[PDB]
């Protein structure tokens, strides 16, 4: 992922312009655009993203998710 694209995505999803993405946005995304995800799977994917359980995704957390390579 181009970091320019990452920064643009973060800006778009930071609705309050507070420097974070609220977990509600992620929940909304997974619930509405996700395909038959369970509520526990949604909570798991949220937890995978917001790693400190702050209820907000900061840019470092966002980058960790988006730019990670597991191969």
């Amino acid at each position: 992922l181009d970091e320019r694209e990452l920064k643009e995505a973060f800006r778009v999803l930071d609705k309050e312009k507070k420097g974070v993405i609220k977990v509600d946005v992620l929940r909304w995304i997974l619930k509405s655009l996700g395909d038959e995800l369970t509520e526990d799977e949604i909570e798991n994917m949220i937890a995978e993203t917001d790693t400190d359980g702050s209820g907000t995704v900061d840019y470092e957390e966002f980058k960790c998710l988006m730019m990670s390579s597991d191969a």
Binding site: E8, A9, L13, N44, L65, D70
Partner: peptide, 24 residues
Amino acid sequence: GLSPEKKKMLKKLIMQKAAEDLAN
């Protein structure tokens, strides 16, 4: 941990939403 299917879906959906919202 997340399975790669779920992690890939998560990343895909996040980007789709960003693209959608940019568009209005």
